[PDB]
């Protein structure tokens, strides 16, 4: 919602574990383990910028991730993040995420990568053996063949 602890608490709430709708209370090491899992999942998604970009901020090497650090995700990315976190940490508590949670996580990941896929759908420039036709007046500048890609 606003910090990594919130992403963990909402994910646990979705799974039905450690939520105030069932009078269940939280364990601090559950927070620590789920934050570590969230960090690992976000890093695996990111792949140092070669994968999905969500605006998530990763804790530096010197300071281990904590509950109170802001996630930095966009307002349209929180839902997918905590749904996928719940799916990932479901086996932790000997549980399997319901079909609705899995479907929501898949839909959220699709929506996260939609804009990146649109941005990365860029055509390559013309080949290096393509001639610039006589209709281009820049041909007079000795630019008879295209620049290489």
């Amino acid at each position: 919602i606003k910090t990594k602890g919130d992403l963990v608490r909402a994910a646990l709430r979705k799974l039905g574990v450690a939520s105030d709708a069932t009078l269940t209370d939280v364990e601090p090491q559950s927070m620590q383990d789920a934050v570590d899992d969230l960090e690992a999942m976000m890093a695996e998604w990111y792949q140092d910028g070669k994968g999905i970009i969500t605006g998530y901020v990763f804790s530096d090497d010197e300071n281990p991730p904590a509950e109170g650090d802001d996630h930095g995700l966009r307002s349209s990315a929180v839902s997918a993040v905590f749904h996928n976190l719940a799916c990932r940490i479901a086996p932790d508590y000997a549980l399997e995420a319901t079909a609705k949670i899995i479907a929501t996580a898949k839909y959220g990941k699709e929506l996260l990568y939609k804009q990146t896929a649109i941005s990365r759908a860029k055509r390559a420039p013309y080949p290096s053996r393509m001639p610039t036709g006589s209709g281009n007046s820049f041909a007079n500048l000795n630019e008879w063949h295209y620049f290489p890609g």
């Binding site: 055509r123 390559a124 013309y126 080949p127 393509m130 036709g133 209709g135």
Partner: peptide
């Protein structure tokens, strides 16, 4: 004719 030939050349190249 010129436009069609240019379009097919673009298809061939890209």
């Amino acid at each position: 004719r010129n436009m069609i030939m240019s379009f097919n050349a673009d298809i061939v190249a890209r």
